[PDB]
Design a protein around this ligand. Structure first.
Ligand SMILES: CCCCCCCCCCCCCC(=O)OC[C@H](COP(=O)(O)OCC[N+](C)(C)C)OC(=O)CCCCCCCCCCCCC
Ligand SMILES: CCCCCCCCCCCCCC(=O)OC[C@H](COP(=O)(O)OCC[N+](C)(C)C)OC(=O)CCCCCCCCCCCCC
Ligand SMILES: CCCCCCCCCCCCCC(=O)OC[C@H](COP(=O)(O)OCC[N+](C)(C)C)OC(=O)CCCCCCCCCCCCC
Ligand SMILES: CCCCCCCCCCCCCC(=O)OC[C@H](COP(=O)(O)OCC[N+](C)(C)C)OC(=O)CCCCCCCCCCCCC
Ligand SMILES: CCCCCCCCCCCCCC(=O)OC[C@H](COP(=O)(O)OCC[N+](C)(C)C)OC(=O)CCCCCCCCCCCCC
Ligand SMILES: CCCCCCCCCCCCCC(=O)OC[C@H](COP(=O)(O)OCC[N+](C)(C)C)OC(=O)CCCCCCCCCCCCC
Ligand SMILES: CCCCCCCCCCCCCC(=O)OC[C@H](COP(=O)(O)OCC[N+](C)(C)C)OC(=O)CCCCCCCCCCCCC
Ligand SMILES: CCCCCCCCCCCCCC(=O)OC[C@H](COP(=O)(O)OCC[N+](C)(C)C)OC(=O)CCCCCCCCCCCCC
Ligand SMILES: CCCCCCCCCCCCCC(=O)OC[C@H](COP(=O)(O)OCC[N+](C)(C)C)OC(=O)CCCCCCCCCCCCC
Ligand SMILES: CCCCCCCCCCCCCC(=O)OC[C@H](COP(=O)(O)OCC[N+](C)(C)C)OC(=O)CCCCCCCCCCCCC
Ligand SMILES: CCCCCCCCCCCCCC(=O)OC[C@H](COP(=O)(O)OCC[N+](C)(C)C)OC(=O)CCCCCCCCCCCCC
Ligand SMILES: CCCCCCCCCCCCCC(=O)OC[C@H](COP(=O)(O)OCC[N+](C)(C)C)OC(=O)CCCCCCCCCCCCC
Ligand SMILES: CCCCCCCCCCCCCC(=O)OC[C@H](COP(=O)(O)OCC[N+](C)(C)C)OC(=O)CCCCCCCCCCCCC
Ligand SMILES: CC(C)CCC[C@H](C)[C@H]1CC[C@H]2[C@@H]3CC=C4C[C@@H](OS(=O)(=O)O)CC[C@]4(C)[C@H]3CC[C@]12C
Ligand SMILES: [Ca+2]
Ligand SMILES: [Ca+2]
Ligand SMILES: [Zn+2]
Ligand SMILES: [Zn+2]
Length: 248
């Protein structure tokens, strides 16, 4: 429903358990209807929303669309938490692709996305064609041993882990999903590469509709496609002092 929040049934109250369950890789708090009722104010913060304890934005509608695969906040066993790389130079290589598109597209799409971010951080991404790279972008089905399937085409569309020496900074995208650049038959990879690989920098969802990673996005695609003041500010929080500077 255009307003889903008060047409919210059984279905949507499970998609919330679903959606949160899939990021944490199980969370003990997200199971149980009462405990979940509290957790739902936390999930709002992962949609960027400054109101926590109200549904009013598209949030419960939009969540049923394939729009986040990578966790927005990172909880991962076996490691100390830190969304940062340790070097001044990082590397990239597309190690498997969606075979609906030819490799030459999927290769270079990520090269745009990492260069968009690239400019404003103390970090350089160089491309390598010898072996493994720092960031491995791969395409897979959800049968390959990790927690929970990607579905097929539709609901949920990737997984990725925060920057670590080997295992981290890397992504697996859904290959049964349909992706695109300009040809429109898919989800646009130019945004989805940028949003995936930006959680690697530590970033969140915005509440400003001008910002690259606004989830409740409506009709009007960015034609040049650029970072805004809020998106530049999202990097300044990482390599400066932390401050929220959104206002009303
Ligand atoms: C030019 C006149 C002088 C000629 C002799 C110079 C000799 C240099 C000898 C040492 C060469 C290797 C140096 C190297 O690996 O530097 C690494 C840095 C990155 O260090 P990085 O990991 O960012 O900082 C370390 C911090 N840590 C441990 C916390 C992660 O930086 C790099 O990773 C970026 C540089 C990569 C170089 C790759 C090879 C380019 C050869 C190009 C030539 C092809 C034919 C023209
Ligand atoms: C020495 C540095 C440059 C090497 C370039 C030539 C390499 C030719 C093959 C040499 C022996 C390579 C052995 C090898 O591992 O090949 C596989 C790589 C892919 O590594 P990766 O994509 O990680 O493989 C993933 C899949 N896996 C894990 C199941 C193996 O795939 C390859 O590396 C094949 C790449 C073919 C296309 C290379 C295009 C180069 C630029 C052409 C410029 C065109 C400009 C218009
Ligand atoms: C040097 C002057 C050249 C002048 C070129 C002038 C413009 C020519 C355009 C030719 C376009 C070929 C169309 C083609 O079938 O591409 C097939 C694909 C490339 O995928 P692509 O079409 O980029 O995207 C398709 C995405 N999809 C499935 C979601 C619709 O790729 C393949 O399936 C693999 C590669 C096939 C190579 C085709 C090129 C030779 C075709 C004629 C072979 C004649 C042999 C006698
Ligand atoms: C002074 C002399 C100058 C002479 C002219 C330059 C000659 C060398 C050109 C090097 C390639 C430059 C053209 C090129 O990048 O084509 C890429 C396209 C699509 O890339 P895409 O990003 O979609 O288009 C890029 C440009 N853009 C965004 C501004 C529209 O690619 C395609 O759409 C191809 C789709 C079908 C085939 C897919 C698989 C191809 C495999 C490789 C076949 C063998 C090539 C040796
Ligand atoms: C003699 C040479 C003659 C050539 C004639 C043409 C000369 C150039 C004319 C203009 C060409 C395009 C200029 C350019 O910067 O294109 C960048 C593109 C697309 O950027 P895109 O994000 O679409 O637009 C960028 C601007 N933004 C963020 C504000 C929207 O981004 C790319 O297309 C990505 C490129 C990936 C390159 C893949 C190979 C990378 C290097 C690998 C090296 C390995 C070690 C050797
Ligand atoms: C077989 C393979 C052989 C490979 C040979 C490779 C030769 C490589 C030469 C590389 C020379 C690079 C020079 C340079 O400083 O480039 C970058 C800057 C802009 O960097 P910027 O985008 O600010 O990123 C800065 C650093 N960051 C990420 C850590 C914040 O650049 C600028 O500030 C000035 C830019 C002037 C135009 C640059 C070219 C743009 C069109 C690219 C066309 C490619 C046609 C083939
Ligand atoms: C043999 C090398 C001798 C000279 C070596 C000089 C030092 C080179 C490293 C300079 C370090 C400081 C500047 C810096 O970080 O610039 C980085 C930028 C952006 O990195 P980033 O913003 O991380 O964008 C990553 C994507 N990438 C690598 C595909 C451009 O990179 C760019 O903006 C690239 C701009 C285009 C340069 C034109 C390269 C043309 C290659 C044509 C290859 C045709 C091969 C047949
Ligand atoms: C004036 C025009 C100026 C044009 C400047 C264009 C930029 C030139 C950049 C050269 C360096 C780029 C390095 C690079 O990142 O290549 C990107 C891709 C593949 O990267 P790579 O990671 O090897 O791809 C993964 C492995 N793969 C292909 C098996 C799936 O590369 C490809 O996917 C390969 C593209 C088709 C190249 C085919 C050439 C066949 C030569 C055939 C004759 C061989 C000798 C008999
Ligand atoms: C003046 C004194 C110096 C003389 C010149 C020295 C130039 C050396 C440039 C070396 C470029 C390649 C560097 C490289 O290490 O690539 C390694 C990868 C896999 O190595 P791997 O052992 O998997 O990882 C090595 C690095 N490690 C242990 C730190 C993780 O390797 C691969 O993935 C590809 C292996 C096949 C490479 C084929 C290279 C020649 C291509 C020949 C034509 C193609 C034939 C099909
Ligand atoms: C006929 C043609 C065959 C192919 C010719 C290629 C000739 C190339 C000359 C220019 C080489 C340019 C490629 C280059 O940058 O090689 C540097 C590589 C690593 O580059 P880098 O960008 O660090 O790769 C990083 C990859 N990562 C993130 C997984 C660690 O460095 C390495 O990883 C380590 C060095 C490995 C090779 C050392 C070779 C020693 C030869 C000793 C001979 C002794 C005879 C007794
Ligand atoms: C004798 C008559 C000669 C007539 C000359 C015509 C010259 C046209 C120059 C235009 C330069 C515009 C700047 C540029 O880099 O434009 C690239 C565009 C779009 O980049 P971009 O919007 O990222 O493409 C995304 C994918 N798309 C279009 C499917 C949505 O790329 C595209 O949308 C596709 C590229 C179309 C190129 C048409 C020219 C083909 C080369 C003709 C060479 C004639 C030599 C005599
Ligand atoms: C010899 C030296 C070579 C210098 C080459 C420099 C090349 C610079 C290219 C940099 C990248 C350009 C990308 C570009 O197309 O931006 C478009 C913008 C905004 O377009 P937008 O409204 O975002 O739609 C953009 C997508 N498009 C192009 C596919 C429809 O378009 C604008 O906002 C409007 C532009 C209005 C220009 C009216 C005239 C300004 C003065 C021109 C003076 C030229 C005298 C020769
Ligand atoms: C009678 C028959 C007529 C024939 C008609 C043939 C078709 C003519 C139209 C061809 C299509 C033109 C499309 C066009 O507006 O492309 C503009 C592009 C990028 O615009 P942009 O706003 O960046 O689009 C962003 C990418 N998008 C749409 C995918 C989100 O612009 C570019 O990417 C800029 C390319 C040049 C970049 C220059 C960068 C280096 C400048 C320094 C150069 C020094 C040279 C010495
Ligand atoms: C001279 C004539 C007799 C032969 C002409 C050969 C042309 C150049 C074409 C036709 C058939 C083409 C291949 C088809 C098969 C593919 C798969 C394709 O994979 S994708 O997943 O990148 O689309 C990569 C290119 C490649 C190897 C093509 C290269 C280019 C290819 C050899
Ligand atoms: Ca899916
Ligand atoms: Ca890694
Ligand atoms: Zn997200
Ligand atoms: Zn995986």
């Amino acid at each position: 429903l255009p307003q889903e929040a008060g047409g919210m049934s059984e279905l949507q109250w499970e998609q919330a358990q679903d959606y949160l369950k899939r990021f944490y890789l199980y969370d003990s708090e997200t199971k149980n209807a009462n405990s979940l009722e509290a957790k739902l104010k936390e999930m709002q913060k992962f949609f960027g929303l400054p109101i926590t304890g109200m549904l009013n934005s598209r949030v419960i509608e939009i969540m049923q669309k394939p729009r986040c695969g990578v966790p927005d906040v990172a909880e991962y066993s076996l490691f100390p938490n830190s969304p940062k790389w340790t070097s001044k130079v990082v590397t990239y290589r597309i190690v498997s692709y969606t075979r609906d598109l030819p490799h030459i597209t999927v290769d270079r799409l990520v090269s745009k996305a990492l260069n968009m971010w690239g400019k404003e951080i103390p970090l350089h991404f160089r491309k390598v064609v010898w072996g493994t790279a720092d960031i491995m972008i791969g395409f897979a089905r959800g049968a390959h041993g990790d927690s929970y399937p990607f579905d097929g085409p539709g609901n949920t569309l990737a997984h990725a882990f925060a920057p670590g020496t080997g295992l981290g900074g890397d992504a697996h995208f859904d290959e049964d999903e349909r992706w695109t650049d300009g040809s429109s038959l898919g989800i646009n990879f130019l945004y989805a590469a940028t949003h995936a690989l930006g959680h690697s920098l530590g970033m969140g969802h915005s509440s400003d509709p001008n910002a690259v990673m606004y989830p409740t996005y409506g009709n009007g695609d960015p034609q040049n496609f650029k970072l805004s003041q809020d998106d530049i500010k999202g990097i300044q929080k990482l390599y400066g002092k932390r401050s929220n500077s959104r206002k009303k």
